Design an enzyme around this catalytic site. Sequence first.
Site, PDB file in Angstrom:
ATOM      1  N   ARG A  38      68.356  21.710  33.130  1.00 50.17           N
ATOM      2  CA  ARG A  38      67.098  21.113  32.702  1.00 50.17           C
ATOM      3  C   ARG A  38      66.605  20.029  33.656  1.00 50.17           C
ATOM      4  O   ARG A  38      65.399  19.863  33.839  1.00 50.17           O
ATOM      5  CB  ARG A  38      67.226  20.539  31.292  1.00 50.17           C
ATOM      6  CG  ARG A  38      65.871  20.266  30.654  1.00 50.17           C
ATOM      7  CD  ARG A  38      65.993  19.398  29.430  1.00 50.17           C
ATOM      8  NE  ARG A  38      64.692  19.207  28.793  1.00 50.17           N
ATOM      9  CZ  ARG A  38      64.403  18.187  27.995  1.00 50.17           C
ATOM     10  NH1 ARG A  38      65.326  17.269  27.744  1.00 50.17           N
ATOM     11  NH2 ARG A  38      63.194  18.079  27.454  1.00 50.17           N
ATOM     12  N   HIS A  42      62.888  19.863  35.298  1.00 51.13           N
ATOM     13  CA  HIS A  42      61.994  18.713  35.259  1.00 51.13           C
ATOM     14  C   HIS A  42      61.785  18.071  36.625  1.00 51.13           C
ATOM     15  O   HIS A  42      60.845  17.301  36.813  1.00 51.13           O
ATOM     16  CB  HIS A  42      62.482  17.676  34.242  1.00 51.13           C
ATOM     17  CG  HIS A  42      62.184  18.049  32.820  1.00 51.13           C
ATOM     18  ND1 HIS A  42      62.360  17.176  31.769  1.00 51.13           N
ATOM     19  CD2 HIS A  42      61.703  19.195  32.285  1.00 51.13           C
ATOM     20  CE1 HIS A  42      61.996  17.770  30.644  1.00 51.13           C
ATOM     21  NE2 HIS A  42      61.593  18.992  30.928  1.00 51.13           N
ATOM     22  N   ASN A  70      61.182  13.223  29.215  1.00 53.57           N
ATOM     23  CA  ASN A  70      62.506  12.816  29.683  1.00 53.57           C
ATOM     24  C   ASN A  70      63.171  11.711  28.871  1.00 53.57           C
ATOM     25  O   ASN A  70      64.392  11.714  28.694  1.00 53.57           O
ATOM     26  CB  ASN A  70      62.441  12.347  31.139  1.00 53.57           C
ATOM     27  CG  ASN A  70      62.196  13.478  32.107  1.00 53.57           C
ATOM     28  OD1 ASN A  70      62.776  14.550  31.973  1.00 53.57           O
ATOM     29  ND2 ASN A  70      61.347  13.240  33.097  1.00 53.57           N
ATOM     30  N   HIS A 170      66.812  28.346  27.518  1.00 53.59           N
ATOM     31  CA  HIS A 170      67.121  27.937  26.159  1.00 53.59           C
ATOM     32  C   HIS A 170      68.163  28.843  25.512  1.00 53.59           C
ATOM     33  O   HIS A 170      68.283  28.898  24.285  1.00 53.59           O
ATOM     34  CB  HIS A 170      65.831  27.884  25.337  1.00 53.59           C
ATOM     35  CG  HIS A 170      64.904  26.785  25.760  1.00 53.59           C
ATOM     36  ND1 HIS A 170      63.598  26.701  25.331  1.00 53.59           N
ATOM     37  CD2 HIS A 170      65.105  25.718  26.572  1.00 53.59           C
ATOM     38  CE1 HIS A 170      63.031  25.630  25.862  1.00 53.59           C
ATOM     39  NE2 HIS A 170      63.923  25.017  26.618  1.00 53.59           N
TER      40      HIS A 170
HETATM   41  C1  HEM Z   1      58.445  26.725  28.707  1.00 53.39           C
HETATM   42  C2  HEM Z   1      58.399  25.303  28.395  1.00 53.39           C
HETATM   43  C3  HEM Z   1      59.481  24.555  27.948  1.00 53.39           C
HETATM   44  C4  HEM Z   1      59.440  23.660  26.925  1.00 53.39           C
HETATM   45  C5  HEM Z   1      58.247  23.272  26.054  1.00 53.39           C
HETATM   46  C6  HEM Z   1      60.753  23.092  26.806  1.00 53.39           C
HETATM   47  C7  HEM Z   1      61.120  22.154  25.850  1.00 53.39           C
HETATM   48  C8  HEM Z   1      62.397  21.625  25.657  1.00 53.39           C
HETATM   49  C9  HEM Z   1      62.745  20.705  24.597  1.00 53.39           C
HETATM   50  C10 HEM Z   1      61.833  20.209  23.476  1.00 53.39           C
HETATM   51  C11 HEM Z   1      64.069  20.442  24.733  1.00 53.39           C
HETATM   52  C12 HEM Z   1      64.867  19.556  23.777  1.00 53.39           C
HETATM   53  C13 HEM Z   1      65.085  18.178  24.375  1.00 53.39           C
HETATM   54  C14 HEM Z   1      65.816  17.235  23.438  1.00 53.39           C
HETATM   55  O1  HEM Z   1      65.901  17.528  22.227  1.00 53.39           O
HETATM   56  O2  HEM Z   1      66.302  16.191  23.915  1.00 53.39           O
HETATM   57  C15 HEM Z   1      64.539  21.210  25.883  1.00 53.39           C
HETATM   58  C16 HEM Z   1      65.876  21.345  26.279  1.00 53.39           C
HETATM   59  C17 HEM Z   1      66.368  22.198  27.268  1.00 53.39           C
HETATM   60  N1  HEM Z   1      65.553  22.968  28.086  1.00 53.39           N
HETATM   61 FE1  HEM Z   1      63.600  23.361  27.851  1.00 53.39          FE
HETATM   62  N2  HEM Z   1      61.616  23.624  27.745  1.00 53.39           N
HETATM   63  C18 HEM Z   1      60.839  24.495  28.486  1.00 53.39           C
HETATM   64  C19 HEM Z   1      61.321  25.214  29.590  1.00 53.39           C
HETATM   65  C20 HEM Z   1      62.608  25.181  30.120  1.00 53.39           C
HETATM   66  C21 HEM Z   1      63.003  25.750  31.406  1.00 53.39           C
HETATM   67  C22 HEM Z   1      62.054  26.403  32.416  1.00 53.39           C
HETATM   68  C23 HEM Z   1      64.339  25.462  31.553  1.00 53.39           C
HETATM   69  C24 HEM Z   1      65.196  25.744  32.628  1.00 53.39           C
HETATM   70  C25 HEM Z   1      65.100  26.862  33.515  1.00 53.39           C
HETATM   71  C26 HEM Z   1      64.725  24.712  30.376  1.00 53.39           C
HETATM   72  C27 HEM Z   1      66.024  24.323  30.068  1.00 53.39           C
HETATM   73  C28 HEM Z   1      66.422  23.558  28.982  1.00 53.39           C
HETATM   74  C29 HEM Z   1      67.783  23.280  28.629  1.00 53.39           C
HETATM   75  C30 HEM Z   1      68.998  23.922  29.290  1.00 53.39           C
HETATM   76  C31 HEM Z   1      67.770  22.413  27.583  1.00 53.39           C
HETATM   77  C32 HEM Z   1      68.997  21.778  26.925  1.00 53.39           C
HETATM   78  C33 HEM Z   1      69.341  20.484  27.649  1.00 53.39           C
HETATM   79  C34 HEM Z   1      70.468  19.708  26.992  1.00 53.39           C
HETATM   80  O3  HEM Z   1      71.026  20.186  25.985  1.00 53.39           O
HETATM   81  O4  HEM Z   1      70.792  18.608  27.491  1.00 53.39           O
HETATM   82  N3  HEM Z   1      63.651  24.481  29.533  1.00 53.39           N
HETATM   83  N4  HEM Z   1      63.506  21.954  26.418  1.00 53.39           N
HETATM   84 CA   LIG Z   2      60.213  16.234  41.408  1.00 54.33          CA
END
Ligand code: HEM
Ligand SMILES: [Ca+2]
Length: 306
Positions: A38, A42, A70, A170
Amino acid sequence: QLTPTFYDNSCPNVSNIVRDTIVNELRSDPRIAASILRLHFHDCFVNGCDASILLDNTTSFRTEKDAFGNANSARGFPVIDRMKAAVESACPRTVSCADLLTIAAQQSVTLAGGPSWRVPLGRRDSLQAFLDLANANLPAPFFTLPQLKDSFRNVGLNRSSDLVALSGGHTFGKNQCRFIMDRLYNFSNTGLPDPTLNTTYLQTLRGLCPLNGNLSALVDFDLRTPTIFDNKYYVNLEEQKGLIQSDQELFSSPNATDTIPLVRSFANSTQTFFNAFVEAMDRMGNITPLTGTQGQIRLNCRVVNS
Ligand code: HEM
Ligand SMILES: [Ca+2]
Ligand SMILES: [Ca+2]
């Protein structure tokens, strides 16, 4: 042009050092692989993959760590510091933080059971951080499909395959209750839950995220395999079990004519998903990089060289 062989002469052991660091960290924090992937995402969506997200506050510019996407969410920074130090010891002033984070993301995916590939390298580090740009460019879980598509196109990823495949991130990791409260109790001011959320799963999520409960409580993005990087994320969508709005919209949005077939294709074949993920990952990793003599090879990822 970025190339996978960039460090084959100057620091051939970089990938192994990065892998070793993550393997060690996973023992105490099984969430670190997801967190690192992630961070790369970002980083790339804000002025490109230039390690701008790793910079801390200065009196001239604010850190992206305080961006809405973030703050109290992004994590794993100390781990990046650790591998950076180890790489600096093995190869002084050679590997940029931007490249390090890219390799870390790939190694994290592979360690979690995902595909293995050599990412293009040669990126250099930013001379500043971009908080406003981060607030503007990072997508939000409440975005509609058109807004998600807009967000990806804004940074250079025009393909629906980019959006559907990268959303596969995800397939593991955690999400705070705060981001799904609307889907569970009052979606779009209707006073009702999101109709695209499976009603059985709705009950489970309400139990984990009760109204007026701890909004920081964490829930798994993938109810099938919470920490394994696989295509289960898409099987979930097909059953209306995507966790956040942005996940489920890939399959249920009125504008999903182009994304539905991709979701199905990835749910039907691990090979198809993995190939698309690597392709999309390298495309995202190719967003406006600083190369050659542009930017620097940051020694401490938290501060610009002085
Ligand atoms: C398409 C739009 C996307 C949205 C709206 C989105 C939104 C989010 C949100 C709301 C969280 C939860 C954060 C939290 O509760 O602290 C998150 C976590 C995460 N996202 Fe996404 N995300 C997107 C795309 C992606 C992409 C492109 C990747 C990587 C290729 C990604 C990888 C992750 C991962 C692995 C987590 C878990 C991180 C952790 O557990 O520390 N996300 N994302
Ligand atoms: Ca950058
Ligand atoms: Ca999974």
